[PDB]
Design a protein around this ligand. Structure first.
Ligand code: NA
Ligand code: NA
Lengths: 261, 274
């Protein structure tokens, strides 16, 4: 399957992998322009289970890893820099495990390397919501999105909240077979021992106020990676890269500037 | 099994409300938040207060327990119920401890009947809703008015996330303990619980609170997202004799989650009032 992708700029290639429910478009409001200004070529794409493949099911982390590898291959950009968030960070982790030759260095945001209890509770709650067929009313769905994704400081800022609520109407997340299958694309076992063999330089970024993927789980991944290090962004929830894009972009661009392509 | 007569409601009905009265010392009336029965004060607050020689009055707010089917009442109805409890026991002016909706009722009681309240601790409170909190209120109303019922695991996760500190949420053993506790303190979706959602600021009440003379301790919980601690600070700032204290590593249920820190602060405050 060809996945839709957007290819911008010329220069050292960086492949962005969005998290569950995110199209490649997720990276364009805040990341791509900054990376273009710094002279990178940016590739974004629609993960399996999004957009044209929203009715796909029965796929696994390995399928998504293969999809990503195929993208890097087909564009002739091996090895590429990789930026991944949540599910996207997991896919990047797992890609570095099987095909380290395709990745020169990586940033992994809001990530984890085992099936921790927070993930278990999330899995169960989401799968249940899906299987029940219940539709959350719109304002209640938006309140849940606000609470799960943003820091305290943002929720206190009246103008910001008005924007994020507007932002939700411009960013609808349809409940699809694809979205449900993506829920399964997460650690099912302790992958930390496997990450101990990843040689690439890696920056793990944890977001301070993250309740979906608490920052301490990112520390575990950075600790396991021989050349990994951990950075924490304050006052950032799970959508830290959208919320504090200046802090997050500075961290990634400083890291990527320090390492060879 | 004690009961007192509540105020007449806007539909001209008079109902009775259950209360509990323990101890012989200085009277303290506890006012629980939305969904909370009087028994919510008994695991952590009542034993400490009794040991300090206070008498503890707790009760079931209109819309809870025996009155869970009550509807059509307002903030003013609940203020008058609380006044009636104080007047019935002849304990005016009484010390008051309120949390969240209970703190709002205590504030509004002090505005209209200051002679009934000598001093108060107001936990997890506000004098207006900000944008986020107005929206959260609209969302809850919508869920209820929609008839849609949350699946039980989803519901449990939301309850945990909304009420506890990051320090609790990161502690797998503590999370298990609270989750089991939820099973023992179900929050039934009732007409009373829905009507309590509108017992909240509909306008900015901060200007009104500048006329409250009584000494007040406002306690904010640092990780509270339901009633963020800056909104508590605004109440303390409005009150000419109010002061603010913040408890670290405490979510919306801070008085239950960090009971020692909360109880210590309240008892230090009450020992020095007026
Ligand atoms: Na490391
Ligand atoms: Na003050």
């Amino acid at each position: 399957i060809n996945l839709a992708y957007d290819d911008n700029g010329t220069g050292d290639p960086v492949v962005f992998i969005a998290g569950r429910g995110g199209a490649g478009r997720t990276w364009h409001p805040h990341q791509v322009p900054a990376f273009l200004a710094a002279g990178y070529r940016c590739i974004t794409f629609d993960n399996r289970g999004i957009g044209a493949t929203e009715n796909a099911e029965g796929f696994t982390t390995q399928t998504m890893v293969a999809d990503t590898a195929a993208l890097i291959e087909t564009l002739d950009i091996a090895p590429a820099r990789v930026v991944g968030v949540s599910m996207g960070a997991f896919i990047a982790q797992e890609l570095m495990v099987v095909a380290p030759e395709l990745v020169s260095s990586a940033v992994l945001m809001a990530t984890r390397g085992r099936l921790d209890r927070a993930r278990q509770f999330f899995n169960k709650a989401e799968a249940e919501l899906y299987d029940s067929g219940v539709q959350l009313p719109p304002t209640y769905d938006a309140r849940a999105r606000l609470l799960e994704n943003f820091s305290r400081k943002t929720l206190n800022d009246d103008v910001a909240v008005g924007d994020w609520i507007a932002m939700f109407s411009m960013w609808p997340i349809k409940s699809t077979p694809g979205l449900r299958c993506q829920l399964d694309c997460a650690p099912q076992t302790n992958r930390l021992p496997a990450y101990r063999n990843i040689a690439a330089p890696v920056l793990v970024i944890g977001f301070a106020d993250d309740v979906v993927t608490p920052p301490y789980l990112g520390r575990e991944v950075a600790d396991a990676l021989p050349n990994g290090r951990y950075l924490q962004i304050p006052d950032a929830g799970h959508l830290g890269f959208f919320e504090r894009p200046e802090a997050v972009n500075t961290a990634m661009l400083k890291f990527f500037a320090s390492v060879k392509a």
